[PDB]
Design a protein around this ligand. Structure first.
Ligand code: CO
Ligand code: CO
Lengths: 472, 472
């Protein structure tokens, strides 16, 4: 197991201290400082790796405790960052994100209030170092964790999060299934400095012993509350998989590939009844605004092959995603929308155009997209092309794809390969959008390259030990 | 050493037979047939792998001999595919390419005559299976070979070409330096079914014992003729590195990174004299049209960092590339133009716009471009993004980049990784351009995926054994 120091030679973990004016709380916003030679100034980069060498049985420091306690004592009807933003309040979370992004706190407040950025930050996830997702900010990367072929210990489970974030993952989704979902998710949350998302229909399905037909709103509702209480920061909910959209998939090549979308479709077809998450959307909003769980409105009809890209079914769901987004905003619930999928490069622009218009610029969250189907074993590359392109056009969060996509479960090498490919795509998108100061990273490395400061070049890279070993 | 059968289980090498009407010569155009299950028709793909299990000491069959002999007996003032095309003649080479691309022979003739496509096919490379490079055809991939840290045997040298083409390389460049350049290039040419390019200034530099100041037109001229006699199909010549463009690089971050560009710049600065390849362009054309060597007009001022992308120096050279292209066409010499380099995604469109206009749609040949500098060790990915994008916009030949770029020499794993990444980029570009029948490949694999025909899925992929091993 490599340490932070072994993964990033010449780097130190640092914190920028700022004071939240309104409360007097002192925030310590993390960054990584790369120490350089030859009189070059040290280079400061973003850091999601979190506190190091913390005993998993104890869990991370509850850094947000005093923030949450103060807001509870003041009293408030809703607990979401959007609610606070619309009241004109700059929270600790907003100031923390502003500092982390090197932007103005008012700008962060504005973006959150208008629904164009979200800060996934359940009040029960006290261990979280706040981060922001939105087109006006750095492009972010999500990594998924789940069941290992063999049951994991607590150290092994937590290491999945520590490993993905070491390489740059900005959020995690815990997609675990099986008999120990609650317990392992507790281990993850108490030991995660990054936001943690889930797809709650997975656990609800397990509560009814794998029988989709026995799902209903009530067991879904109970599952949502259970997960919110633990601290889950966002829920993927496929509320746009409407009964009347299911037949639109009949002429597809790969059908419905989304697991959550498949579950909802099966239930809807069994009873010829409308999607129960859609029907109970308002009730879901009531849950979310007591905790601040952000809603990641799923795309259950995402295309699973190039043939199916941008079809009638996909865009029918996108339209409903927009409706659900505006409805959530009425109750001050933070929203992002999930997107494709497999999409060839010439069809990527249409995806962004329609999402920006139909969903009122809510942040977009894509899986890739994969730009070709021909290379299983290399879908981190086929999708990095798509992710970089759709990111350049405004996509705010990129769900990673590993070389094992379509084939099997990812090992640690696979996870690292996936995160690195996605950090490349995300930064290439930052450059393409001319995001402030993004090119400074490239310039520092290229300067080291020109001047034969090899150690500096390696230290500045996304994966220093690979560069160093390849050179040696 | 894996065989063709081990690299591509369920595939066979086949040939499509067509008759060249004018001569009566029978052509056998190669393809790979993937045999599928469940009543699916076999899927036919492009194949550059060439004849298998041929003794390197004997060399490949001289398949073009009767074509070249007949044209010599008829008599002709020039020997280039462009000259023949402008005379209204459809050659064996044109018919072979048309068959290989599933397009009309007249269309191929038209594209070559107008300078919008080239068929690199030196009359002395009799072993060559003809292929075409141009925006209207499949996007092609070049792989580079050169010196191993330790001197190679003939089998070892030839294996570099056999390996790169097995994975899909469409052309090779032999970039060897040192004391045995002529001999090893002979081994390569007599054993290569794909076009082979060189950068002749490298060998000319070796003839003057590594002293750039002792280069001149005369030793360059001798080097060109030597290489043309062996069968080299195209020459990279940096004739656009003009004396007055050198100072335009003074404010760059990484300066002149092209090795050939650096050599010419050093010579020009030493004497304050104009580039001797530029000055003797007409004389170079006289050489090329007796053999049909295509000219790949170099970009010696290509940008070597994101900071330097699309600068005044780069575009000054591009303008001259256009002048040299039109001049070559006057003498019926086939031309492509070389391009960047390191270019961030938002600057890619300008590159294609200017090249298409200033160089009269001559085929473009890029190295990537790399879309970010931050990930040495992964520049096959940073550049695959750029290559796919610039390919989608019309770039005809993509020079590959391996994970060892900027770091060291590529081993066989590195070469394979590079070729696969570039076949992905090239095919993603084919899809983006809506190239006829390109999506059929994706559709076949995705159909196998939907139907759980695992072996078929693997057999249809770019790298079947990786997919199969990852699944198992
Ligand atoms: Co998929
Ligand atoms: Co470079």
């Amino acid at each position: 197991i490599p340490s932070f120091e072994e993964c990033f030679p010449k780097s130190t973990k640092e914190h920028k201290e700022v004071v939240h004016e309104e409360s007097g709380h002192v925030l310590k916003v993390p960054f990584r400082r790369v120490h350089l030679s030859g009189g070059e100034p040290a280079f400061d980069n973003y850091d999601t790796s979190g506190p190091q060498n913390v005993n998993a049985h104890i869990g991370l420091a509850k850094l947000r405790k005093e923030w949450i306690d103060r807001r509870e004592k003041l009293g408030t009807p809703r607990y979401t960052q959007m609610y606070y933003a619309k009241q004109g309040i700059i929270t600790e979370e907003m100031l923390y994100c502003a500092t982390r992004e090197k932007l103005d706190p008012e700008f962060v407040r504005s973006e959150v209030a208008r629904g164009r950025a979200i800060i996934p930050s359940n009040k029960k996830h006290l261990e979280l170092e706040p981060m922001i997702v939105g087109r006006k900010f750095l492009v972010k990367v999500n990594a998924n964790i789940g069941n290992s072929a063999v049951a994991s210990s607590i150290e092994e489970e937590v290491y999945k999060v520590q490993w993905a974030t070491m390489w740059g993952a900005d959020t995690i989704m815990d997609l675990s299934t099986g008999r120990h979902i609650h317990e392992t998710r507790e281990w993850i949350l108490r030991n995660s400095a990054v936001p943690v998302g889930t797809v709650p229909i997975y656990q609800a399905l397990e509560k009814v012993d794998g029988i989709a037909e026995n799902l209903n709103w009530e067991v879904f509702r109970e599952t949502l509350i259970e997960q919110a209480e633990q601290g889950v920061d966002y829920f993927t909910i496929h509320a746009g998989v409407l009964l009347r959209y299911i037949p639109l998939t009949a002429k597809r090549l790969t059908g419905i590939v989304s697991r959550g979308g498949s579950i909802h479709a099966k239930w809807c077809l069994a009873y010829h009844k409308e999607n129960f998450a859609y029907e109970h959307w308002d009730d879901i909003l009531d849950i979310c605004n007591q905790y601040d769980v952000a809603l990641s409105i799923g795309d259950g009809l995402r295309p699973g092959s190039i043939y199916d890209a941008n079809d009638t079914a996909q865009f029918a769901e996108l339209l409903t995603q927009g409706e659900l987004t505006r409805r959530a905003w009425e109750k001050d619930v933070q929203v992002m929308n999930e997107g494709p999928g497999h999409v060839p490069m010439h069809k990527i622009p249409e995806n962004m155009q329609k999402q920006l218009e139909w969903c009122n610029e809510a942040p977009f969250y894509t899986l890739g997209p994969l730009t070709t189907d021909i290379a299983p074993g290399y879908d981190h590359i086929t999708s990095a092309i798509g992710a970089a392109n759709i990111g350049a056009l405004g996509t705010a969060l990129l769900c990673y794809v590993t070389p094992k996509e379509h084939l099997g479960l990812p090992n640690r090498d696979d996870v690292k390969a996936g995160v690195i490919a996605y950090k490349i795509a995300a930064h290439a998108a930052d450059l393409a959008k001319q995001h402030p100061h993004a090119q400074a990273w490239d310039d520092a490395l290229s300067k080291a390259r020109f001047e034969f400061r090899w150690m500096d070049q390696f230290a500045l890279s996304l994966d220093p030990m690979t560069a160093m070993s390849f050179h040696d």
